[PDB]
Structure formats: C-alpha cells, structure tokens
Symmetry: C6
Subunit: 333 residues, 6 copies
C-alpha cells in the first residue's frame, strides 16, 4: 500500500530522469520559430527549447511573458527530429498540462516567463512529462528536484549575454555540495530544515492575516498534502544522496548569458553536463555559425587548440551589464 506508492514514485522518477540523460553532453537551443528550429538542429543541437521570444527580447518587450502560442510549438515540433522542449510560467499548472498534451518532450518551469504563482511551483511528480527547472543555489535545486524536476539548470541572468550569473550559480551549488560532503548526518539535517523553509511562506502570510504568530505547527499541511517536517525529511534524504554522489542526482546543465564558444567551454570545464543557450545564438550576427561553434565548443571544451580554431568567424554576442539589468530574473524560490 504505502510501499507500492513509494515504488512507482521511484520507477517513474527514474524513467523521467532517464530522458534527461539522452540530452547530456550537448547544447539545447532556444527557438521561436520553424527556421530557428531548423538552424538549431542543423547546427548539432541535441534539442530545441520553444518559446515566444528569446530572453533578451523578453527583456526588451516588458509586459507579461507566457507559454508560447500552441501553433508555434506545433510548427516547431514539425520542423525538427530532435526533442522539442517548451517553457511555461512558474506554478502555472494549466500551461504545463497543455504543453504535455501537445506532446513536448520536456517542460521547463522557467523563471524567464512571468511567474504565475507567488507561493509554489508546479507539483511535477503528478505529470507524465519530465520537467527541467532553474536553480541559483543548492537549496533551490533540491527543492525543485523534490517537486519532481528530472533535470536542473542554472538560472544565470537570462538574455544578458553575461556569463557571470551562471558562474555564480554553479559555484554556489558546487561549494554547497562539497560542504554537505564534509558534514555529519545531523548537520546535514539542519541544512535540510533550512532548505525547506520557503514552503512556509503561504502559511505565514495567512497566520499574519489571521493575527496569529508565524510559527510552524507540526501537523499542519503546507504543500501538496505534506507537513513541513515531512518535506524536511524528504529533502534530507535527497541531501544524503547528494553527499554520496558528489553531484546532483539529475542531469545538471549550465544556462543563461552564454554568448560565445569560450563561455560554453567554461561551463563545461566547471563540470556542467551541457549548455542551454537562447539569446547568444539568435541575437548574434551570424546565428548558424555561432550555433555550430557553440556545439563544437561543448564537444571540444578540454581542447584549447580546437576552441581557438572554432571561434574564428562570428560577430556578436551583444549586451547588458551589471548596471541596469532592470529586471534581475534569478528569482523563483
């Protein structure tokens, strides 16, 4: 009864996780239309990511960023043989189920789209389709995993062409893992308690409205039927798995502001499994050339001579500094 529940939770999880492994070692490319899908595939993309506008443009446009039009996603799935992934707004369950129904290979609960739910992410374990989610540090990654993400990427700062935020997120996650490895089981439990705190945020908001103190009550269901303590337990388990593994239990990709072959190489060299690039490619002057270049960079990242030759023709990345990013997009939690 209980044990069988626990059993499909795990067989299905492992299957979903399994899909992610297919995409490992390659580049996944944001694509807004049939053409771009083709350019992407032709350039050696392991898969494309369908959205309405690339993040750089999302930034320029302002307003609300939602799931791509169904027509567009269709058109893209038709244009290519490789897996098609698509983006949905954080917490927006309906968008995800439409995406799943449409037959996309993976759904990305994306912090670049305007979040739908201020409190919770989608509960991903309920879906058949596998999810990829963003994380700016290990707490985030673990929560996202616990909610059922089959793959995680760094958030970085999307559409900025600036690799710094991606690098920060990778280092934060990695150092946090190494810290876990140096801890006693009990200490790790404390970290698990900290990492589950965000789920309390609804509850506490409501305690405040009701003129009660903001306290965690032991039998109080917080999220999707789970008690705070229950979440702390499950997370704790995941942290232990991580301590053993030395890395994340799922495929872990670098994302955001990859603008040049060297950028991609750098991420790979930091121990990432693969690279997501949207804006770097199509906001570039020669998109197909840049595409192929980044692919070859990810395949050759440990070979400086090759990296050097790979980067001999293209004209871009473009722009957006520390000062005036105007919507710092690494917030979901």
């Amino acid at each position: 009864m209980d044990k069988l529940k626990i059993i499909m939770e795990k067989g299905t999880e492992r299957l979903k996780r399994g899909f992610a492994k297919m995409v490992k070692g390659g580049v996944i490319m944001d694509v807004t239309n049939a053409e771009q899908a083709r350019i992407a595939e032709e350039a050696g993309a392991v898969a494309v990511m369908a959205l309405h506008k690339v993040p750089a443009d999302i930034r320029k446009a302002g307003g609300v960023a939602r799931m791509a039009p169904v027509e567009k996603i269709q058109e893209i799935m038709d244009a290519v043989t490789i897996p098609v992934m698509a983006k949905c707004r954080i917490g927006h369950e309906a968008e995800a189920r439409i995406l799943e129904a449409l037959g996309v290979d993976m759904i990305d609960e994306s912090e670049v789209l305007t979040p739908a739910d201020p409190f919770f992410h989608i509960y991903k374990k309920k879906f058949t389709a596998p999810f990829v989610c963003g994380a700016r540090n290990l707490g985030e990654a673990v929560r996202r995993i616990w909610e059922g993400a089959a793959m995680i990427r760094t958030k970085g700062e999307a559409g900025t062409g600036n690799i710094i935020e991606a690098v920060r997120h990778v280092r934060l996650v990695n150092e946090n893992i190494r810290l876990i490895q140096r801890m006693t089981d009990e200490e790790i439990y404390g970290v698990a308690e900290k990492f589950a705190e965000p789920y309390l945020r609804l509850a506490f908001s409501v305690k405040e409205i009701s003129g009660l103190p903001k306290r965690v009550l032991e039998n109080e269901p917080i999220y999707e039927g789970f008690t705070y303590r229950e979440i702390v337990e499950d997370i704790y388990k995941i942290l232990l798995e991580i301590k053993k593994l030395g890395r994340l239990p799922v495929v872990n990709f670098a994302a955001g502001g990859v603008a040049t072959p060297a950028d991609a190489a750098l991420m790979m060299a930091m121990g990432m499994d693969g690279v997501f690039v949207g804006s770097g490619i199509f906001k570039s002057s020669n998109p197909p050339k840049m595409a192929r270049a980044i692919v070859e960079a990810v395949n050759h990242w440990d070979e400086p001579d090759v990296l050097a030759e790979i980067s001999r023709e293209i004209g871009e990345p473009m722009r957006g500094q520390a000062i005036e990013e105007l919507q710092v997009r690494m917030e979901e939690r």
Copy 2:
C-alpha cells in the same frame, strides 16, 4: 417588527445568494458598449459586466473612474438577454441605488473604480439588488460578505494581464480556510476579532483628532449601528459556517488578469466557481475568438487535450509586469 427582521432578512440573503448560483460555472465579461455586449453573449458569456472602460484602459487613462454613464448601461441591457451587472465606486451608495433602480441584475462594488469612501463599504444588506465584491484574502471576503455581498471574487491586479495576483488571492483565501478548519472554536473567535479590526479605522482617526487614546470602547457604535463586539460576533458566526462548509458561503469567482484560456483553466482548477475577464478579451487581437476560447476553457478545464485544441488561434496578450504597475489596485479593505 417581530422575528420578521431576523427571518425575513435571512430569506432575502438566501435569495440574493441564489441569484449568484445562476452564473456559476461560466465566464462573466467586462463590456463597454453594445457591440462588446453582443460579442460576449455570442461567445457563451453567462453574463456581462458594464463599465466605462476596461481595467487596462482605466489604468492608462488615470483620473477618476466612476460608474458607467446611464445611457451606456441601458444600451448594454438592451443589447443582450443574459444578466447585465454593473460597476460602482466603493462605498458610493448613490451610484449603487441608481444602478439598482436602472434594474441591473448585480452590482459590483469595485476596487477598480476610484473609491468613494475611505472608511466604509456600502451596506449591502439594505439593497434589493445583490452585490459582488472583491477580496484579496479571507478577512476581506468575510467582511464583504457580512456587509451583504451575495458573491465574492478575487481582486487580482485588474488590467495587468498578469494572473499572479489572482492566484495569490485564491491561495491566501484557501489556506486561511484550511487553517480555520484546523482550529478550536475559541481560536476561531480570535481570528474573528482580527477580521473585524478595519471597522475601527474611522473611530480611531477621530479619537486621535480629539486627543484621546485609540481604544475600542465596548458600547460604541462603529458601523451601521453595530458595536465592534457585535461585528466580531457576526463575523465569528460566518467563520464557523465556513469551517463546516470548507469553502465560502457564497459563489466565489476568480478575477483579474486572466489573459489566455490556460489562465482561466488554472483558476477553475484551483477550485474557483467561475471567471471574470475584462481586459484579456477586448485588449486581445481577436476578441470574439479569445472570448469563445476562454468560455470553452472554463467548460473544459479538466481536459488538457481540449484546452490544447481550444487555444490554437489568437494573438493576444497585454502589458504590465511586476515593476511599474503604478496603481496597485488591490486595495479596499
């Protein structure tokens, strides 16, 4: 002049509440003119909401937003067979009585119009026409109900095309209900005390002007003849009814920033009875298509395959992020 005022008034409450049930399961559409009224009806709207400008436009125009011109409301009631509802300024009793006299089916005391009274809402129990009111959390909803609202909706952030605020309000209300259900009667009484606090606001202002301390006096009439403690009692009663019911005693709709079929479906899927959409439809590129789409979305919300087919043609959208909403229309209390 008997138990007449107790047992008749309750009969009337239940009647008023009764009207609201007619509209349940469907979409109510903001409409500024005869044409839009028609497109709405034709698209399967269960009812239309008459106002001068759709919220998105209200925002753009600035200045004072009042009740629609009587001519316009008339014109709209003529154009369609389904119920016509109309908006009035918070606390503006005269506007409401004119609306009622005009024979509208329901009056919305709306936080999207410029509030008329900084202290109090309209005392709705005195009206024959039934009222719908906005709420951003349970305290608000309960107060609104106590004042005689027959139906409540979430405020969301009107005219932003952003579903986040609506979702926040639904979650706050729901979690607060679950919290009530886990409470002893005495604890619930405490919450009732907290929920009645806002009525003291005009008393306290005057105490301060009078150089007295701001204190609640036991026999002091605060609002429409009621003592603070009296309000606390009635509210408490309502809370208890909620505890039993597991939901609100009246029809409860989602509103504010529904921009796409998926949005409406998400609201339905969170347990709302129905959806209000103004700006999402007529600020969209193909209003009739979007209208019918949202209707069919609300009818088919638990069927992802249908949702998917339903949103295959429309071009539509809106502005309004987070940053620079410039108005933040989620205030009435």
Copy 3:
C-alpha cells in the same frame, strides 16, 4: 455704547447664521463670469460663488490664487438675482473688507485660494458680512465657527472631481460629533483643549526664536485678545451646544469634487444641508445640463428612480486621482 452695543453684537451671530439658512437644501455654484452666473441661476442654483478660476483650473494654472477682480464680481452680481458669494484668501482681511464693501452676500475664506496668513484666519465676528469656511474635521469646524463663521462646508479636495475627500471630511466630522455625545462634560473639556491648540502656533514659533521653551503661559494673549484658556472655554461651550444639537450649530454643506448627480445625492444622503460645486459643472461637457441635473439630484436625493432618470444625458470631464494631486488643498487649520 455698552448694553445696546452688547445686545446688537450677541444677536448679530444669530442673524448671520440666519442668512445661511436661506441657502439650505440647494446647490451653490462656482462661477467665473456673467454667462456662468446666468446658466447657474437658470439651472436652479440657490446661489453663485464668484471666483477668478474654478478650482480645477486653479490647479492647472499654479501661481498665486487671489480674490476675483472687482469688475468680475460686480459683473456677476449684476447678472443674477440669487445671492452672490465670493472667495478670499485665508486670513486676508483686506480682501474680505473689499468683498463686504462690494456688497457680496457671503464671503468664503477659502482654502482653494493661496493662504495670506500662515498663522491665523480672519476674525470673522468683526465683520457685518457672514462667512462660510472650510473644515476637514470637527476641530477645524469648531475653530472656524468660534472665529465667527456663519456656515461651514467640507474642504474635500477641490478641483479633483473626486468625492472621496469630501466623504472623509463628512465622516470625520460626524463620528467626532457622535463621540462628543457619548462623553462626560469633563472629557469634552479635554477635547476642547485639544481643539484650541493650533492658536499657540505663532506663540511657540516666537518662543523658539527667543530661546525660551515652548509652553503655554496662562495670562498670555494668543489671538485677537484671547488667552489660550479663554479660547479653550469658548470652544468648550460650542462643543456642548453640539452635544445637545447632534450636529453643527450652523448650516453645514458638502463641498469639493462633486462631479455627477449621484455624488451630490450621496452627500445629501449623508446628512449634509446642501452642496457646493464649482468644477463638476463647468469642466463638464454640457454645463447647463449637468447644473440642472445636480440641482434636481439634491432636491430628489432620496428617490433612486428619479436620480436614475435625472442622469440620462451628460458627458463631464474628470481628472486628478489619488496619485499626483500635486497640491493637496485640504490645509488651513
């Protein structure tokens, strides 16, 4: 003379007060010229209020707003049979004596004109002409009365077409009266002390300049010969009269941001004796229609069916939300 002079002077207040009663139940309309005076009278205005520009325009123009040109006031008094009232700057004694000499029926010491005196209002008891004054709460109203105002109105926020500030002022006054009625005589005395505080303001400024502590000295003449304690006594008397009367001892009108018939009706329904409207009428698209409509609204305010019919044709101009009123004209004290 002594005893005769006394007699004359005591009964003078009641006479002045008496004039105010003539205007009770109707609408007083701001008018800048002969035509507007005519339209006003024709529309059933009980009286006109002569000024250089209507408040909405006063706002737009910036700069210093003074008494209207004598020529203009003349021209207006000639154009109509009903009482002509005129505005003067707060504390500007000369402007008022010129107004009185010109034979206006009432002088309004108006917070919409640029105040002349940062410390004191005109001492109105010395005038033969009766004064109307603005008040945003009971303290203000009582002080203005004590200085000899024969009639008081709410300040509201003039020229905004927004009824909210008017409503706030009405409620603050009323609640403060109810509070008074629930008080022991001694308590009321305390309120009297609080209400007379503002007169100390020029004393204290000078104490500070002189390097002395800011203290009330018992025999020190503050205003027009009166000691602070003397003022406290007179005010206390007036408060007691209010406690008895249940309202203000003088005719009390609603003013500012009345934009539509329903607005005026609302004010009447809150227990006001009558309505001042300047901007609502002439900044409206169809001023004579709006004028007559507001008059008929005030006459028919308890009759929703009539209010409804009354409001069937007009198109009036509205502006000035909460955000960016830029002037906030509710200051005199």
Copy 4:
C-alpha cells in the same frame, strides 16, 4: 577718556533714522530704468528703489545678482525728484561705498541679491548713507538695527507675488515684541543672549578648523571689535527700548510679494509704516494703473469703500506658489 563722542554717536544715528521718517506712510517702488522711475514718481511713489532686475526676474535669471550698473543708477537719479535708493549685496562693503559716493539717498542691504559675505553684514554705523535692511523676525531686525540700519523691512518672499511670507514675518516680529513687553528685565536679557548668537558663527567655524571646542570665550573679539558679551549688552539695550516703545525704534515697512491693492492695504492694516513693491507693479499688465492703485490703497487702507473703488481696473501676471519657489530668498541672518 571718553565723554563727548556719545552725543556724536547718538546724533548721527538719530539723523539717519531721521531720513527714514520722510518716506513713512507711502510706497517705495523697485525700478530698473528711467521710464519705470518716471511711472513710479508719477504714480505717487514716495521713493524709488534702483536695481538691475525686479526680484521676479532675478529669480528667472538665476546666476549672481549684484549691484545695479552705475550708469543705470545715475540715469534713475536723473529721471526723478523723489529719493532714489539702491540695492547692494549683503556684506558687500565696496558696493555700498560706491552707492554712497554716487549719492543715493538710501542703501538697501538686500537678501534678494546674491550675498557677498557668508558671515557678517556690512557695518552700517561707519557709513554716512542710511541703510534699510530686511528681517524675517525680531532677532534679525534687532541685529540689523544694531549694525546701524536706519530702517527695516520684512523680507517676505521676493518676486513671488505671494503676500504670505511678508505676513508671517510681520506676525513673528509683532508677537515677539508683545512677548518682550510681558517679560521681566532678566528674561529679556536671556532673549538678548539668544539674539546675539549668530555673530559666533565665524568664530566657531574656526574653532572647529583648529580642533578646539566651540565655546564662547569672554574677551574674544567676534565682530567689528566687539566681544560677544558686548553685543549681547547693546542688543539688550535695544530690546528694552523696544519694550518701552511697543514697536521698532526705526521706520518699519512691509515688503515682498505685494501684488494687489488689497495686499498693500492688509500690510498697512497690520501696523506697518509703508510698503515696498517691486515685482507686483512692473510684472503686472498695466503697471502705471497698478502703481497708482497701490499708492492710493496705502493712503486709504482703512476705507474699504475706497479700496473697492481703487481696484476696478488692472490685471496682473503672478507666478509662484509654495511648491517650487526654488530659491527661498528669506535667508541672511
């Protein structure tokens, strides 16, 4: 030893004070050129005030306002028979000596010109020409007198056409006089201490620079040879003289923002000896009419019927409000 000099010292002061009395009861008009000098004289100005630009224009122009050009002052002295006064920068001794050498009848050490000395005013006693100075309260007036001013005016807010600041200054001065009259000699001495404080400002600046504490040293020469205590003594004397007199020992005029006949009347009615008006007249639409009108207003100020007839034709640009005066010219001290 020293005996006879006292007579001399008193003698000159009284003579200087003398000249001021000639101008009492009338209007002094700012004039920038020969024509305005003429219009002014013709209109019954007792004297003209020569400057480069009228204060309103001084405001508009920004930059440094000095000393009118010598040619211009000459040209003005030629154009009229009445006394010519001229403005100089605060503390600018050279400008004053040139003005005196040029044979002006009075020098105004004016807070409307850009101050020359951040610490001290001109030591006026050393001059043969008599000085008029501004004061925004009694401390200021007394200091200015002690430095040898033969006449003082209120500062008001020059060029604003707003009488408020003038009225404030008059009230502050008057109430401070009445406060003096109610004081024991010892108390008055305290006020004298406070009023002499500003002279310490350059001493203390230097103590701070020298890393000493900011203290008053008893034998230390602050200003023009005088010890702080010495100044406190002389000031005390002047305060006593004021207590006896009930007013200032010198001719006292109202100044700044007088824009209309009623304004001038109001100042006279508050007990001022006369009125300075620059901007009110020549920034008016009909300068000669307005000029004559203000003159007749000052002659007839206690006669409302006359005031009323007097202001039957003119109309005059007047710009600036409380908000955004941008300069706030009442600072010298």
Copy 5:
C-alpha cells in the same frame, strides 16, 4: 652641512618669497592665448596666469583639466613682458617640472585643475621655481606654506563670478590668525597638531587595508621623509611666526569669482595684497575695459569716488549661484 643647511633653506625660501613681493598690490589675470595676454598687459596686469581654459569654461567643459599645452604657454611668454605664471594639477610633479623647465616665473598648484594626487601636494621646496597655492582656511595655508609655497591665494569658488567663497576664505584665515594671537604657546601647539592631521590620510588608508588600527606611530615617515611629529613641529614654528607677524609670512592674494571692480575693491579692503581674476574679465562683454577697470579698482580701492567713476562702462559679467555649482572646486587639503 648641519649649520649651512638652515642658512640655505632660509636663503632659497626667502628668495622665492621675494619674487612674490614683486607682484604685490596688483592684479594677476588668467589668459588662454597671445591676445588675452596682450589685453591683460595693456590693462595694467602685473602678471598673467597661463591656462588652457578660464575656470568658468573649465566648469562648462567637464572632463579632465590639465596643464596648458606647452605651445600655448610659450606663445603667451612671447606675447608679454610681465611675469607669466602657469597652472598645474595638484600633486603633479612632472607637469610642474616641465613648467619650471619652460621658464615660467611662477607655478600655481591649482585646485581648478583635476587633481593628480589624492594624498599629497607637490613638495615645492625641491623646486627652483616659486609656487603659489590655494587655501580655504589657515590650516590649508600653513600646510601649503610648509610644503614650500612662496605665495598663497584664497580658493574661492573659481569660475562662478560669485565673490562669496573668496570672502569666506579670507574671513576664515583672518579670524584664525587673530585666534592664534590670543593663544598661549602650548595652545598654539595643539592647533599645530590639528593642522598636520591630513598627512596621515595615506598612512591610515593603508593601516585599514592591512587590518591594523588607524594610529599615529611616532617614528613612522608619513611625507617626504618627515614623521608626523616632525611636521607638527615645523608647522608650529610657522604658526608662531604668524602670531608675531599678524598675517601670513608670504604674499597673500584674493582669488575666485571676482566679477566687478567693486569685488576687487572689497578684497583689497579686507587686507589682501592683490587680486587674481580669470573669468571675471574674459567672460565679460568688454574684456579690456573690465580689465583696466579692475586694475584701477585695486589701485584706488580706498577711494569710493574713484571706484564709482571707474565702473561707468561695462557689462555684466558672468553668473552662477549657490544652487547647482555642480563641482564645488574648493577642495585639495
């Protein structure tokens, strides 16, 4: 060695100081080119100051202000017989050595040019050419002298045409001298300690970087070999010399914002030896006239009749205010 060193320090210092005396009693004029040099000489300038742009223009141009081009300085030295002085950036030793090699008569280490060294001024004693330096108070002047300045001027606010800052600086210096004269030798030693503080600024910055407390260490070499205590001793000596002398041991000129003959006269009348004017003359409408006028003003500054005649044609000149000077240029310490 030991005994000859002093004779030599004294000898060279005294010679350098000697040059300054040649220029005493006259006007030194900022000049950007051959023509201006000529106009200056012709007008009775005792010397010219060569720079790229006059201070008013320096302000307008923004960017970095350096030593004039060598060609320009050459061209100027050729154009005139009187001494040519030239400006260099604070602390910029190389610019000064080039100026000296070019054979200028005096170098000005100027706070109007963009400072080169945030910590220290040029050590002037090492140079054969004599230096003039700015000071806004006595501490500054003394430090500048100790570093070997042969002449000092007030900083004022350069390019503003506003004499106020010059006057402030003159007063601060003078009062601080008078304070010195009233002090015991020990007290003066304290002031010496205070005046030598700024040299510690680069030491303390480094202590903070090194994680040490900011303390003065007794044998620690702060500046050009000198220990802090050593500097306090030398400074103390100079202070004593000042106490005896009643003034500064070097020629002391007024500088900055002298815009009119009366300005220059005022400076002279405050006990300055002479006047620097750049902007006042060439930003004037009639530069040669203004130039000659200011010269003649300095020559007859105690003769009001003459000053008055001297100022009969020119206009205006220049402008700035307190508000928005945008680069307050009196800093360097």
Copy 6:
C-alpha cells in the same frame, strides 16, 4: 609535491616572471587593429595589448566586454614583431586558454572587461602563458601574485584620461610596503591573515544559504584545493619576500588614465617599471605623435628639459571627471 615542487614551482614561476622583465622600462599600448598595432610598434612601444575596444570606448559602449575576436588578435600578431598581449575577462579560464593556444605572449586578466567570475580569479599557476593582473592596493597585488601573476599593474580608472586613480593605487601599494618593512614578522603574519580574507567570500555565501554561521573552518578547502590557513601561509611568505626586496617580486607597471607625456613621466618618477596606455593615445587627436611622445617621456622621465621639448605638439583626450564616471572599474579583488 614534496621537496621537488618547491624548486620546480620556483622554476616555471621564475621563467614566467623573466618574460615580464623584457618589457620593463617601456610603454605597452592598447591596440584594437592592424594599423594601431603598427603605429604603436613604430612609435617605440615595447609591446601591444590586443582588445576589442580601448577602455574609453568600452565605457561609452556599455554592455558586456569580452576577449577580442580571434581574427583580430591574429591580425595584430601578424602586424608586429614586438610582444602581443591580450585581454581576458576576470576568472574566465576558457578565454585565457584560447588566448594561450593562440600564442599570445602575455594574458591580462583585466578588470576593464566584464568579470566572468564573481568569486575567483583564474588560477594562473596552471598556465604556461604568463599573466599580468591589476591591483588597487597591496592586498590585491599579493593575491594576484599568489594566484600566479608574473606581472602586476595598477588598475587606475581605465579610459578616464585621469591619472588620479593610478596615483592613488601606486601610493597605497608603496606605503603598504613601507609599513611591512617596519613590522615584526608576527605583525606581518596578521596582515597576511587580512589579505587572504576575500577567498572566504564564496564559502560564507554558502554557509549563509545553508543557515550556518559564517565561520572559517580549519580543514575546509576554499580555493584550488587550498585551505584558508594554507593561503594565509603562502601569502605570508610573499609578504616577507616583499619586506626584504622593498618592492614587488614581479615587474610592476602603472596603468589607467595616462593621457599625456607628463603623466607617464610622473608614474616613472614614482618608481613604476613602465607604463600601460590605451585610451590616451588613440583617443588623442594625433595618435602617432602622442605615442612616440609618451615613449620618449618614459625614456627621459628624469630630464625635465627633454620632457618639455617632447610635449611640443599634440592635443587631446578630454575625458572624465570624478563626477559621473558611471562605471568605477577598479573592482576585482
């Protein structure tokens, strides 16, 4: 890694350090293209620095500044015989390895490019190519050295044409060396502790995320395998070497805002080994002239007569003041 990796690290380090010595005594010029490379070489540049845009332009352009296109670097290495150096983003390891592969003679880890890593610099010891790094004080310089920099320069404020920041950094470094020389070994150890602090920054961020206190743990690996204490030890060694040497163990150049021959001369005269100039030359009006001039200035820096002659024709680089540098590029740490 026992006794042979002390001597073998000495070998490679000393070789790398050796290359730097080749460039000592000359000017290194930023160059964006073939032509500038040529002009540079022709003008006596010891080496060129290849980048996409000169720092002044980097500032103007905003956006992300990365490594130069490979084509451009190639083109430059072809155009000249002297060493070609190239810039890379801080911490961007891939860019550096591509640069090294391309065969550049030196890599500059430059704070003028957009940093890639918010936590760490490239670990330079692992590279065969030698690195030059920027430092704003001794702590920085030492850390950069420990990471394996073979040469260090001051950061200054790049592209501002303002020598002040360069001078500040030189003084800060120098005074901190002198401070070191005055310290006991134990004291120096404390400085070593302080200088190693920045490495803890990513550890502590992660401790905070994990809800632990921010503490240094003794066996915890921080950077490239090293424990905090280990770094403290290595740094301490370097400090001691500095104490002996009286300067930095590597070639030390001045950089940042050198705009004129005198600037370069000043730097040399402060004891720098040579000068970097990008913007000063090519943003100048006559680049070749200015180039040769700065070279000859660095060769002749102790000869004022020569400096003087050397600076006789050129004009330019208006650049950027203290106010509104808008970027403040001296941050890496």
